Homo-oligomer: A and B are copies of this chain.
């Protein structure tokens, strides 16, 4: 069967960090559900791009388990993700089903807010490092993409493709990842 991905879209999310993973995962054959945190209404992102979610998080959650839960960045987007009790529960569940959790840029700070994957090696956008490392609950990494167990993190808009292809490789293998990468004309 097809692998499934849940991308949580919160108001203020970084649109590039949301669209790149969604697009690349879909090119890999992954079934992606763009779930709106606040609901089914269109979501205005960090740079005002408005994206219509496939479903509300409320409805998306009750829709079977996901092979990966993706948390885009964006300062306001990550803030919203961090304050959501719904997201807290979702991430906790993913940890227990031993499911992959991927967060990029400011997104990893949501993991800290919901006490997810403590002790793991993680990376974030440089400007989110101090926030993420407050309390020393993680080991920081400078890698553009860092994968420690079922905790996958990345640094920013510029590492979005690497971040997405890493997710693809973790879910569909190196071959599928290479196939999806070729047509993108990356560096």
Interface residues of A, Cβ cutoff 8 Å to B: 14-16, 19-20, 22-23, 26-27, 34, 42, 46-52, 54, 125-127, 144, 155-159, 161, 183-187
Contact = CB atoms under 8 A, between A and B. Distances in A.
A51 B48 contact: no
Given A27-B47, A52-B52, 19 more contacts: A14-B23, A15-B19, A15-B22, A16-B16, A16-B23, A20-B157, A22-B47, A23-B46, A23-B47, A34-B49, A51-B51, A51-B52, A125-B183, A127-B183, A144-B185, A156-B183, A157-B185, A158-B184, A159-B185
A36 to B, nearest CB: 11
Given A52-B42, A158-B185, A183-B156, A20 B16 contact: yes
Query: How many copies of the chain does the oligomer comprise?
Result: 2
A157 B155 CA distance: 19
28 contacts: A15-B19, A15-B22, A16-B20, A16-B23, A19-B49, A20-B20, A22-B47, A23-B46, A23-B47, A23-B49, A26-B47, A42-B42, A42-B52, A48-B54, A50-B52, A50-B54, A52-B52, A125-B185, A126-B185, A155-B185, A156-B183, A156-B184, A156-B185, A157-B185, A158-B184, A158-B185, A158-B186, A159-B185
Query: Nearest 8 CB-CB pairs, A to B?
Result: A156-B185, A158-B186, A50-B52, A158-B185, A158-B184, A26-B47, A23-B47, A155-B185
Contacts of A144: 185
Contacts of A34: 49
